[PDB]
Amino acid sequence: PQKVCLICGDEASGCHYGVLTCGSCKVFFKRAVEGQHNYLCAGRNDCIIDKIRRKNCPACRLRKCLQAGMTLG
Amino acid sequence: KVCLICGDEASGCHYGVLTCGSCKVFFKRAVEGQHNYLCAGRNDCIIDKIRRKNCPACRLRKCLQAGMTL
DNA sequence: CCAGAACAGAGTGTTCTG
DNA sequence: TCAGAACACTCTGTTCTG
Ligand SMILES: [Zn+2]
Ligand SMILES: [Zn+2]
Ligand SMILES: [Zn+2]
Ligand SMILES: [Zn+2]
């Protein structure tokens, strides 16, 4: 029955900012939208985002967050 | 004057290849240490001063292909 | 100069709270 | 229920040292 993060496939802690996610992707999304970051993809803007590689490309991670419908209101 | 790994300003010839300091210490730490680097793209990730943190796997790959060794 | 050590920061992830 | 605070850890890069 266990719930899965729609961003990285890790265990989802709950519905955060409109989307079923884990804590890491939650706080990441908050920090990313509000914070001033220089995220730039090194691939083709389609990087695989899972528990191991989510640290690799913050750009694609934020992209998946936004496309999932995450918002702060 | 330019790092053959990320194109940043090269500090000198390290481990056999003209590199900067960051790629020097990165290479040593990567080779000796037990890391779980995994590429999220297609093994052709752009490694420059801005994005070199993104894919350690491809960075290490460029180091090895450059001939770096201990 | 070059190798290695050591110090410091960015980014991240978990725990705790209401 | 979920949002936010805050501490702690990993990885990295510069400075220091032999
Ligand atoms: Zn997640
Ligand atoms: Zn990417
Ligand atoms: Zn370099
Ligand atoms: Zn890569």
Sign of CA dihedral B24, B57, A4, A62: positive
For an interface test with B, give the residue of A7, A40, A50, A53 to mutate (most B CBs within 10 A). Answer: A53
How close A44 comes to chain B (CA, Å)?
A: 7
| Distance from C-alpha of A16 to C-alpha of A70, rounded to nearest angstrom | 8
Chain A residues with beta carbon closer than 8 angstroms to that of B51: 40-42
Look up the CATH number of domain B1-70.
3.30.50.10
Nearest to B47 by CA among B39, B37, B59: B59
Under a CB-based contact definition with an 8 Å cutoff, are residues B66 and B60 in contact? no
If you compute the radius of gyration of chain B from its CA atoms, what whole number of angstroms results?
11
User: Is domain A1-73 in CATH 3.30.50.10, yes or no?
Assistant: yes
Q: Tokens 């350690």 label which residue?
A: B56
| Distance from C-alpha of A5 to C-alpha of A23, rounded to nearest angstrom | 9
- What is the per-residue burial (b if ≥16 Cβ within 10 Å, else e) of B49-59? eebbbbbbbbb
**For residue B63, is it left (φ>0), alpha (ψ between -120 and 50) or beta?**
alpha
How close B69 comes to chain A (CA, Å)?
A: 25
| Distance from C-alpha of B26 to C-alpha of B14, rounded to nearest angstrom | 11
CB contact under 8 A, B51 and A40: yes
- What is the per-residue burial (b if ≥16 Cβ within 10 Å, else e) of A18-54? ebbbbebbbebbeebeeeeeebebbbeeebbbeeebb
Q: Which two tokens stand for residue A23?
A: 């804590």
| Distance from C-alpha of A34 to C-alpha of A60, rounded to nearest angstrom | 17
Which residues contact residue A68 at a Cβ distance below 8 angstroms, ignoring those fewer than 6 apart? A6, A7, A19
